[PDB]
Symmetry: D4
């Protein structure tokens, strides 16, 4: 089952974390982790600050790097370098309503591509992505070349966006404390 | 083939059985069991009463529990706890006309989800479901929390309904002796 | 797991059954069925008499034939013609102490052969056999030719015996009521 | 590849063969055999007359039976009883223009069903069918019960028709010498 | 690879933990967890006390039960009921020197059995075991019957011991604070 | 992943190479090789001239033949005869803009066929093809018969075209130095 | 099963056949073909003379070549070039007593090698070999280089001999009419 | 086949190459590359000097790093970070007589371990190793910790040595020009 083949990954922030703010009593990042854990057996967090907090919830923490690369791609590569699965489902810390069929729908719609990411009907969410580790070398080469754009990389790897326009407000992102108040229950 | 990979399960009733009433000379529950047995090699019955009757037809009977949980979910979990397959096709005792392509269509339309159930064009039949045992832990947690709603659970697991609107009257349910008379041949 | 890939088969007798006699309160044939059911999910009985008794224990009964062939091979072929698995573990009704690792050891020692049977250190037990359905055509041809010898057939199919000389008295066969008394507890 | 997993079967006639008549210098049945052999490695002929002729082309001949059942289903069952593959692609002797993508399209459109057959846009061709051997037991039971209708059986097994309406005149059947003249090149 | 197919499990104690005592600066239970984590991606702890301590190391904690069963078997069953893998490698908290090839050797020596445990040359260690979840139903039945003996259960499931007599002092168990002093570096 | 299962093949020319001309500083053939290498681990070049140039880029060169057959099919067959994979993705040297999802889309759209090629919305590109080695024998027979037409062969093998009409100008072919100037950046 | 994965091949002679002489009423080559057909579904003959005779038994005939190479290796390569399986079991026409477990024992003893051949206790029989088609390219290169020695090639490919010293007189070869008389029954 | 699943790797030297010296007219490193290429489809070279020379033979060159780690382990990790296979067979540049069954024997003797290396009867050759990429994270952690010992790492990963004591002088290493003269033909 996908549950035992894809490693879930909370992208908590590369070199505070707004993901620590509570939504309905639970920190934003833990909404994401809990949603991934309902669908996937093995779930880790990519974090470079507050490691003890993430770890304290029973999750393994993967710290970045080797080289101090910038942005989300750097965390993705760090996780592939430090974890053995074939497949990873990444999600940032601030999208607490991700749907219960995230992994299944992304996988079903992959069309044999090594990477896919969510399009919510309005925009792309390239860091909510199902990634095969076969693109580890390409990612390393991309970052070594000084490149940083997420979607450009994912397209260059042969990926595409998957339509989640029917999953209402599942991909809302909590940008600030103020937005968080529009969502408190 | 699906025939040898999915265990069929007649949900005969958790803690008489109207499924014992005869439709065209054959008990309602045996219509269901026979339909499952045409499509699947290994088929069992979840029953907590009249166990000897079900067993007498050559079917293994799984009794509920561990804990006295309520409703169909309790029987589903009981069956996963007591049977070793990866996949189960559950069906209640009172839907005698289930189609010969039930398992194939549910599986084909799963879209990589760990659970799917029938929608007949008019309504959901959440207890006519193809279930991967990976959701055993989630089900246990759900029931331990005091929750009982079937479709809510199946959605939370990442499942969805599968359209059988073209399978005419295949999902009629015999609620009472009176309805049973509308169907006698 | 082997549990969900091999169909167990009690060879109860082709055209009373001494296998109906009780050993320590349980009929000989049910000792065998219970031993197979501990190791295998799906288990059936090949019987041509007392079908209701076997069936009443929750086991599907396969009756012989098509053609009225003689002996155990006839039952084996009948079962392959009427059951869909790839693999079958046959055992006669009168060997109640068959070991809990029967299927695993036979499979482990197959050496890529399509059939293997037990040798107990003293003699062959060719009807205690793990059989791939690929030899269905060969068996049919053998029986159509008027041949009946079990071990000859199994050798001709490319099979061999597997040493169970360390499984003490596991393959005792209860030939008569008198032998049964040497074993009563 | 499908080429090495599906056994092709020319249904040449159960208990002359009009399939022996030549179309553009090649016997109708050999048009079918050649089309199957382009797509599939292992191809056999079900024949009960002129066995030497079919065999002489390098094809193994499977004769019917065990029991003298009627019609095409009888040949299908005979072939499953005498051949070891999981999958069979049957075709009658008189449809010489069957397409080069017959096996691929039938398989692609199976929708997890154990049997599928061709619909040419105007009618069903239930004997041009892709069949999983899991339905061997059901077929045996059907024929033993005295039933003979092909499509009824295939529906009861959970099968469906596959649209080949775009494959122009690929499913023309040569009923008589006269029709054969409408096709001579 | 085995790394991504077998779930590691530290058996930390069912209803203080001596496994909390430090050996060379690291708690005994964490020696075990670290050894399992070198070989396996996903590793959990079965604990019913000090849950926060185990969880704080980044490990998911599985608490016992459903029913208050006794002993290690109860923890094994609890873990299978609450975790989705096919395979589990259990180890108690007080065997800190378990070898780096534990999972590979147990798996290699399984001989198609659904469970295997370590024999160190002097004695059995039945709670250092590689277990297929197919024996979940058997375990449940065993415990419901009031049975508790570990090795008896594992033999009844078809398992056997695997020789680790060449892995010197790898299976030393720290019974008390005094034994722990014989090992301090 | 497809990356490690399909061998990429640059069809550089059977018995100068215009593919040696530079587009934006990189030879046309190396545009193709680089595009294939982003998607596939193992990539080779079919060349019969300038072998040292192709080889110098780190690519293995496969020279034609056995028999001096004509055209692209000859190179395809040469490559299947000299390389061990199951699957090959061929592309000529003069289509430098082939898309990053070439292999994934061709594979996803194969519909169980052993060969597929690109249609760009305006025309077929039968030498941009995903080919299963099962058609090696058919290809050999075709060429031995004196036949040379690419698309005819691919249709006869059971293949079809795959729509890439949405991949803008990805299949432009540089026919001459003059066309190459319309594309210089 | 091996029956449906390995193609049997009678090596009948490259550019009369003593294999046509009758042993106990059946031609030597047909003893071999029949032995292969008991173990394997799909069996072909490599022949360059008397093609009609071999074909007349229902076997497909593969004629040599492309290039007029010498010896048994030439026939092996011809067969791999013209047949789609992954695995081939070759045997010459004059070893009529080959054992019923030939394919299983060769496969079991392969030790992950791409080719294995029989050693009968006294000598090697390098043309009684189980061959993976991955060595097709190596074979082509070997023959193109002007090399002909069978065992040298098989060793260079990474193969080894498999001990059949316990299969008494199974590998007797009938060199002449005179030897054939020592064997007539 | 192993040929298409394991990537061969010549370890040519991390930050002249004595591997450039000719043995019987062929550079030592090319003896190794050629031996790997006979057994494996895809073979690369890890080199940090003379990259153009290695590349010129048709081999892809992987340069070290990310971080400037020391020794052979650094090259192994570099290759896993930059190549997508599951399995790698590493060999240094100066062991020109490596046997034709290197990959098969190492794989056959792995005993489910993620890494194995050659023991020649006299000593270990830990850089002649079959490595699963699952140990990429462990290797990274090991090197980041400042550790460099090869065999220690391979043991810590759960590996073991494989006996090649019967492969005479296959593992001779050419240390110097003088040793090279003891071997010139
Ligand atoms: Zn059953
Ligand atoms: Zn985990
Ligand atoms: Zn065949
Ligand atoms: Zn390569």
């Amino acid at each position: 089952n996908l549950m035992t083949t894809i490693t879930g990954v909370v992208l908590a922030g590369g070199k505070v974390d707004k993901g620590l703010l509570e939504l309905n009593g639970k920190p934003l990042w833990q909404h994401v982790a809990d949603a991934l854990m309902t669908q996937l057996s093995h779930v880790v967090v990519n974090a470079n600050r507050h490691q003890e907090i993430y770890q304290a919830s029973g999750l393994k923490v993967i710290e970045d790097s080797l080289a101090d690369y910038p942005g989300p791609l750097a965390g993705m590569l760090s996780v592939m370098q430090q974890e053995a699965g074939e497949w990873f489902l990444f999600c940032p810390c601030d999208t607490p309503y991700i749907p219960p069929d995230l992994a299944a729908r992304l996988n079903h719609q992959r069309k044999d591509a090594p990477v896919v990411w969510v399009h919510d009907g309005e925009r792309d969410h390239p860091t909510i992505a199902l990634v095969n580790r076969a693109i580890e070398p390409l990612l390393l080469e991309y970052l070594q070349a000084g490149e940083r754009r997420v979607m450009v990389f994912m397209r260059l790897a042969g990926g595409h966006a998957v339509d989640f326009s029917d999953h209402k407000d599942a991909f809302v992102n909590v940008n600030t404390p103020e937005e968080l108040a529009r969502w408190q229950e």
